[PDB]
């Protein structure tokens, strides 16, 4: 179908524009790197449908804000991606995580759903 056409290519700009960021933060030299990490991103409890989703909108002004204060576009593609997709309240773990541990949870995410549509 066309939404389900739609929604594979999405989920895919999703992953690969998620890792373009964690990619670049990992480019950061060392000292800037090690600032980085001390910010804090709340995390999913559950991720395993569109839906959850909403546990990434309501993270994406932090990542793109810190990410503007790191260097003092794919931010806005992931916007639109989110939105779409998903279309509920979200739960979020006990526990924050670095901006590399919350990247790498949604790229999991997308690639595990893109794995239910191939
Ligand atoms: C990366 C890539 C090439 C073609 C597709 C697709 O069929 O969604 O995805
Ligand atoms: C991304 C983000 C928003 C707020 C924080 C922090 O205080 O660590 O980090």
């Not at 895919?12 to 950061?28: A, P």
């Not at 709340?42 to 959850?52: D, F, I, R, V």
């Not at 991606?81 to 279309?87: A, P």
Request: with cysteine.
């Amino acid at each position: 179908s066309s939404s389900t056409k739609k929604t594979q290519l999405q989920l895919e700009h999703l992953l690969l524009d998620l890792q373009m960021i964690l990619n670049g933060i990992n480019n950061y030299k060392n000292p800037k790197l090690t600032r980085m990490l001390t910010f804090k991103f709340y995390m999913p409890k559950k991720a395993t449908e569109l839906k959850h989703l909403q546990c990434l909108e309501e993270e994406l002004k932090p990542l793109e804000e810190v990410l503007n204060l790191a260097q003092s576009d794919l931010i806005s593609n992931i916007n639109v991606i989110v939105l779409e997709l998903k279309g509920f309240m979200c739960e979020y773990a006990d526990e924050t995580a670095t901006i590399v541990e919350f990247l790498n949870r949604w790229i999991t995410f997308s690639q595990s759903i893109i794995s239910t549509l191939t």
